[PDB]
Symmetry: D2
Subunit: 480 residues, 4 copies
């Protein structure tokens, strides 16, 4: 077994070490071929047919490019061949825990189906990796290539999920601290997983990427920052890092939080909720699990993919009728209808515990307009979206270290005022989208009146088309 | 009316007329989201995750670009808005009849499972379109936009599948319209243009054909008393390059030796599953994977999903099918032994395919072997590579015009273009694989293979001297 | 004569009407082949070899795309063939007035060589267009294609340079036409769209603005009793991104610290050569590099070639000029010391520029230095970065329409889009360089520089702590 | 001094070792910024503004990629850091000897102006490199980085121009290194790889050769007791495609019929200017355009600028030269009459070129002509199109390895790959143009042309029946 070459449209011809090949050629990894990267986004951007499989190869490749580049420029770090493989494997395997339609599954479905548990795709990746290792005899193969399974497995899992609970990591000592910033960077969010999905999502969506990850890799260095070795960027690149998070935000606005993409993810979630009692997935020992409990058994979870959508759509059982009809509505494009978008003003934040009550508030509004129909709470969906630069209210560039041309081993900080006055003043905000489940012309007219009146009552921002969709409501609000 | 815009990575922002949107928003069209364009190719080229859905939008768009371009340059053709919509709809709908894994289903599975029937994806598209029309109340919507369903449905179906003037959907003065979506005269059509661009974007191989350039130089002229789409004389080199590119894409990607063996293993799994999977069709009647083609309501539910239904099954009756698919996941694939071609005049006929594994196993290589292999251990895959018209040069069926007389159609022969062009336009490739994957079986398989090539006067395999050093010295030609 | 087709790597195959071809095939237009789009940027980004000629073809093409798109969607605007040609011509001709190294010539050279005059490339374009028309017998060719030279020439010139309705080339009901080539209201025009795509292709930085998407959503609506080009409401995010991209391109490429210092050195060489180079104009009268702008026949011969005329000269009078250009070839450039910005209300006005090198040399660092530097050893470059309208948000001057009422124009404020947008739309950068390149001079230059930043309450330079560790602790702030 | 990074749109961010930087920052290298890669091609493809400078950086970078790749995969070859630098330097410097408009200068101008000498851009590069080294003190800088100037300079020059082992710069065990920059065995080298990608990016024609794939599969193996670079067996298809692409680029772009006639007109202007332009060289001695090749200090100043020096001149002695250049700006070009090829064994040798205009004018068409044309009215351009090795298949000079024995070199014949490949590897194109551009002259020129083709048994011109309907019936073949 020798180096395989694989041709990827984003990165070109990528070399895979035979241990990587052994990890890839398992049911646990190959599963990612059946999970769309962008979930319901495929129903809006028809190029976005790519799956988590190819994204994962790309993350593994880029993780290897960055660690190899640091090792060649700085031999004094003592990056070993073993370190390189562990970083590549962690890159490959950080997407293993994703579920059907990717963010739909851990962002919408699981929190509604199992409100008592705290599940992330990260934790799932660690569990799925363990199952991959143990079911496929990977440990003897790791030893053959010089890995020490005990320590290296721990290292790999820590790169995915952070400390498995003073230097908190066990897989590598503090002098290799920089290695924990490559695959999943908890300090500031700058990591190779974003770099792959920027390039890959853009190629498939038909929106062009402005971030240059190769340029970043070339200027990257390891320096001592508060007695820990960290990956630092060249001072000059600070503009480009602000542009990188600006790009992330553009991709969320244009594509990932597309108003129709989100409502399709919501409809799929609702179909999976109604189907949950009746779909059975066989796991370890022949025990049966549901869509919502497959996360408790990795053998069941292995078989939980986008296929669930089609199993529901093609079913004939009367018990799956409600689930199936929601999916049929997607095919006919009879979707829940977008009413509009607003934001809170001032320092007002809408917290997760208030979400359920928002459809009630929209239906409780009293627009002074003659209406043919009256709508209820259950007729409205309210979707609250938190947009930020990856670290809630914080500027992630405040957590980046830099070096200068004249002293490349000396780490420095650069503040927002030292770069530009044209940068954002805040780093987080909320969007509120409202939709109506009643699609007829009179219901939709009514829904707009309730919506705009609610925006006025709550002192939210004037919807962009407020004057067109509710001309009788927007004059009562002086500031509009 | 109300145009939708859709953003496609190949063509940019595409406008869809509301009638097209009505056709697209049906179970019969949306089904194409679950059929991979390149089938088992995704298992070799990981970027090739694209489905028939997006390819079909692109063919519809390009069909519209070509017909609009001809109408603007030549008002005298009388291309109406109705013609434009019919051509776009036929473009949209020519892929409706594809099955699971696209060419796998009509190229491998159906010919083995139903050898007596003559099924093509084209005929399937016509049948699926009829079912799409009748199940979704499309005829009143056609009338709303000025189409005449009787004539226009006939036109649309004829553009997909073909037929004194033999067509009924349009008269002879619109003969050129039949050359846009599916060109029976020479193979130059908008379906190829979309898949060249789209497959290349996804495979990571760069496309060298410029379809926009071609559309700009295209004109309709009278050729033997029939109006045809002609190309500019100067463009003749680019058309030879276009078929050269098609041939490269087949060699590099579509007939990739591992892509084909994965399609073969999936076919074998579907054969072993065929008795046991049921698909519900019209009136609750049950169909199999091999009979779903006889009922469009069943066939609607026949997609790549079948692969996962088999892979995830627990039924003991699906065990053999499921194990073949598990072999694909572990990459325990049937092993490639090699490739050869016939020499001289020799062509291998379709009726002799079944007997070829027997001939390879019957060869007597003078090498000491620890295993003996049988007929069933060999797969022999014969691939016909051509320029789309068997042995014919398709450029002999293209008409050209000159700058100084743009309504005068001419012919250009291969001799008038270049001496560096192909001398033949068709050939066969013979790939041999072994179902026994261990190192000793594979060694043995190579000896039988090379010996068979020697016995049959086939070409010396490229690695012949390395894989069978004891066999290749007997053959003086090599 | 009929349509020429030209293949451009940015836009593909572009069609040129024969009148445009006649305008392009003149010495006044073909001159733009010898003026680099990005001037000294080519000396930093080696892909940036592109010239104004191809950019101008692209602007003419995109001007035609937008006016055609508006006309097809809204026949009621009565856009005539004549309007289309005049808009395409204005698009083609808006770069005619550029000088050697593009922005170097009107941004640095002319203001220093002729401080008393107010010259812009725009005014130059109008004058060069008039000369192009009259020297090449274009007026009878305009008449042949239905143009009325009196009104249409006026229209074309007004589209490039601007002026109760103040325009004479078209009445108020065609007011939207003045927003295509050079948009005075908000800066959204086709010239930006071409240079975004073209500069990005050549620089190796990828463009994220989608101009085609913008064209598809564009409509003309009534706004305060005047017809204007409006954008779809949803696209407002993309317009903010468009100016954000313009700003990124300025930071990364157009105001690159070494690109600018190369433009400065070339400017200095042209100043020292100005007394001695002669350019023959109309009548045989002689002009200088700085006076060629007063005679279009001389200016026709004033291109990047002047750089090489100086570099290859042997005349002893051009020695000092030639030596500066030789320093560029050896890469012995004036050295970058650093960058800072003003804080608070502080704005640095154009009348204070000359005094800044004096202030840096007057600073008293409080560290012992081996050499002392003077005013002439420093260059101080002030760069104004904005969104095209000084302190104003250009999106406040954009009109929008909604899906439910496409003829009804609306306004959208910054708070209705996002909290993550910029709070200001203008700022200044100050770069300092040193003409003395040795290690001791450069160390000293950094101490003066950082101390000056401290004295003036400017921002702490990014590398302040590394380049001047003894100076940055004295500032209660840093 | 450490690595510079340079951003190139084709290769991305490229690292330059400080010795390379020292070679690049000289007047001898920087001169390549003023020589267009494609010469007159820019006058047809407006994207083709790129210069030899950036192409050279790219060849240097790719030379380094291939030698690094071989060294990492095969440590037993003992590729040193010194070898890597010498290979990068040879890559950087192989284009130094190009003249104004690249192939125009050594392909057209020099053969006509200096018929007694045998000059190539290769020999020019060696001479320019020597001058670069000696004028800029590069030898001590080479020693600083471990190079041995005597041996390594010889190595570098041998990699550019060529020579029982005939080379002195490296012994036989490093023989593979001579195949990277300029491969005399088969033409597969990094210079092609860069211009495929770069010319395609600028021309707007898409490249289908994947050089990175090739580098990944490349290995060094023993072939007839010499170490050589071998390709993987199954890449053989791709190598045939690589030369097919080279040929397509020649047909579409580099031998464009208008590109070539513009190169011819520029050559004619330079011939008429040759007596009157002076270029100052070493010791103040004066040279002409045609003698600047004999003094590297003069040749340093000989660039595309010469075109504009002629165009902008006022000297009455340069009038005829200047008028030809003015005709290019107005697009009053010599007119294309047509294209033919020889049939049979007939090859047209360089000594018969001068007589061809005479033969066309001597033909006796037998139709009534209003004007009669003479020899000097015709230009006949003979173009040799091949796969880089005259009549030979360059793939017969490629060595391959198989997966099962990667140190064992093999040969692969054309019949082992495909029957759809070219049957010949060389041909000639004959283009005829007319210097008289009026309608009557052009009609006459076509009659003479077609009659000449008939008399000589050349191929029927593609538009023969349209341009000469009365002449093409006499010829039974046609
Ligand atoms: N000619 C080609 N150009 C571009 N990519 C290719 C081409 N041929 C194959 N690929 C892609 C498909 C895969 O992603 C990757 C490797 O394919 P390939 O080299 O065919 O390996 P293989 O594993 O089938 O052969 P082998 O095992 O004999 O080396 O390159
Ligand atoms: N900013 C963007 N840039 C590029 N593509 C986009 C952007 N926004 C959306 N898309 C894509 C997704 C779709 O394929 C296509 C149409 O999207 P969009 O204009 O959002 O339609 P819509 O149907 O959601 O809006 P509406 O119905 O309100 O007009 O363009
Ligand atoms: N095969 C090609 N592919 C892409 N671009 C090409 C090709 N051939 C030429 N071009 C480019 C060069 C020009 O920019 C544009 C038009 O050139 P071309 O069609 O050769 O026109 P022409 O003016 O030389 O021919 P004619 O006058 O006979 O129509 O296309
Ligand atoms: N932000 C950017 N994105 C892409 N390319 C850039 C960017 N900045 C500069 N370039 C280009 C121009 C050059 O070709 C190459 C290197 O430029 P740059 O990093 O600016 O070097 P420099 O020599 O000016 O800086 P220094 O000497 O301070 O390291 O990259
Ligand atoms: Na797709
Ligand atoms: Na990590
Ligand atoms: Na530093
Ligand atoms: Na058809
Ligand atoms: Na082509
Ligand atoms: Na073929
Ligand atoms: Na296949
Ligand atoms: Na597999
Ligand atoms: Na052939
Ligand atoms: Na709207
Ligand atoms: Na260009
Ligand atoms: Na070179
Ligand atoms: Na060179
Ligand atoms: Na060998």
């Amino acid at each position: 077994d020798t180096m395989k070459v694989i041709n990827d449209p984003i990165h070109g011809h990528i070399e895979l070490h035979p241990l990587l090949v052994r990890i890839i050629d398992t049911p646990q990894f190959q599963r990612l071929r059946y999970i769309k990267q962008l979930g319901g986004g495929y129903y809006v951007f028809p190029g976005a047919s790519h799956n988590r499989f190819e994204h994962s190869l790309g993350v593994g490749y880029l993780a290897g490019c960055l660690v190899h580049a640091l090792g060649e420029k700085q031999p004094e770090l003592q990056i070993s061949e073993r370190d390189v493989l562990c970083v590549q494997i962690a890159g490959l395997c950080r997407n293993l825990g994703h579920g059907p339609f990717s963010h739909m599954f851990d962002g919408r479905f699981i929190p509604l189906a199992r409100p008592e548990v705290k599940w992330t795709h990260e934790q799932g990746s660690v569990m799925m990796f363990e199952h991959l290792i143990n079911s496929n005899g990977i440990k003897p193969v790791m030893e053959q290539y010089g890995l020490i399974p005990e320590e290296d497995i721990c290292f790999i899992k820590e790169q995915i999920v952070g400390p498995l609970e003073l230097w908190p990591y066990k897989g590598r000592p503090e002098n290799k601290s920089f290695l924990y910033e490559i695959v999943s960077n908890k300090r500031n969010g700058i990591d190779v997983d974003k770099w792959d999905y920027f390039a890959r999502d853009c190629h498939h969506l038909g929106i062009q990427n402005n971030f240059d990850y190769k340029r970043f890799i070339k200027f990257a260095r390891v320096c001592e920052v508060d007695n820990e070795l960290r990956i630092c960027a060249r001072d000059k690149e600070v503009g480009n890092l602000y542009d990188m998070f600006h790009t992330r935000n553009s991709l969320h606005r244009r594509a990932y939080q597309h108003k129709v993409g989100n409502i399709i993810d919501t409809m799929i979630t609702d179909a999976f909720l109604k189907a949950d009692d009746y779909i059975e997935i066989t796991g370890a020992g022949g025990k049966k699990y549901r869509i919502s409990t497959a996360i408790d058994d990795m053998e069941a979870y292995t078989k939980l993919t986008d296929n669930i959508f089609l199993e529901i759509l093609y079913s004939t059982d009367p018990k799956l009728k409600d689930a199936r009809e929601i999916l049929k509505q997607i095919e006919y494009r009879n979707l829940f209808k977008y009413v509009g978008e607003t934001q809170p003003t001032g320092q007002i934040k809408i917290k997760r515990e208030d979400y359920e009550s928002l459809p009630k508030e929209v239906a409780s509004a009293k627009p002074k307009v003659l209406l043919d129909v009256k709508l209820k709470a259950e007729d409205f969906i309210v979707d609250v979206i938190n947009m930020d630069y990856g670290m809630q209210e914080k500027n992630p560039i405040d957590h980046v270290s830099f070096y200068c041309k004249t002293a490349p081993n000396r780490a420095i900080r650069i503040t927002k005022n030292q770069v530009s006055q044209l940068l954002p003043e805040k780093f987080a905000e909320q969007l509120i989208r409202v939709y109506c489940k009643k699609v007829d012309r009179k219901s939709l007219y009514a829904a707009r009146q309730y919506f705009v009146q609610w925006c006025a009552d709550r002192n939210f921002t004037k919807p962009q088309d407020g004057d067109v969709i509710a001309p009788l409501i927007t004059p009562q609000k002086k500031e509009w």
